[PDB]
């Protein structure tokens, strides 16, 4: 596997390590998703204190309306924050 | 930096690493889309060898038809090609 195969994995991987832990295995509920972004995205987010934080994450997130935060969507998520990341080197 | 966080950089490096090139080198032209895809992504995607599937896959990708693939368009890909590699694991 290349850099990039390895990081396209990377993401299901991670992705599954939270989705993983309760409930509907194949979606992060509100707990899952704080607990990802809290240990995972602490040098690019700020960390998650705070319950109107939690369901706004979500609800921004969450475009079929199911309350869950699934693959499809988690990717869409990855992408602004890779995007931010992106502009933020031009 | 998390796995996670070290994936999303990936992108970026990756990214550029062909987009820097030729030409624009914020964007990916055909020939840089190509190797990027026959060397970065082999375990993934067929070999490119054709010119009829490079203008394919450029055609696919070019969201906005200027001819050229930007990270906003290179992003989509990636996720295409994540979700595929999701759905083989369900
Ligand atoms: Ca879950
Ligand atoms: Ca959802
Ligand atoms: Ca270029
Ligand atoms: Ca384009």
Chains 1, 2 share one sequence.
């Not at 390895?6 to 194949?26: C, M, N, P, T, W």
């Not at 939690?54 to 969507?73: A, H, P, R, W």
Request: aromatic share 8%.
């Amino acid at each position: 596997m290349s850099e990039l195969e390895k990081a396209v994995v990377a993401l299901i991987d991670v992705f599954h390590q939270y989705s993983g832990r309760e409930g509907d295995k194949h979606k992060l509920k509100k707990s899952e998703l704080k607990e990802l972004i809290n240990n995972e995205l602490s040098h690019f987010l700020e960390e998650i204190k705070e319950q109107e934080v939690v369901d706004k994450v979500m609800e921004t997130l969450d475009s079929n309306g199911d309350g869950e935060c699934d693959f499809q969507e988690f990717m869409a998520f990855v992408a602004m924050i890779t995007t931010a990341c992106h502009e933020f080197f031009e």
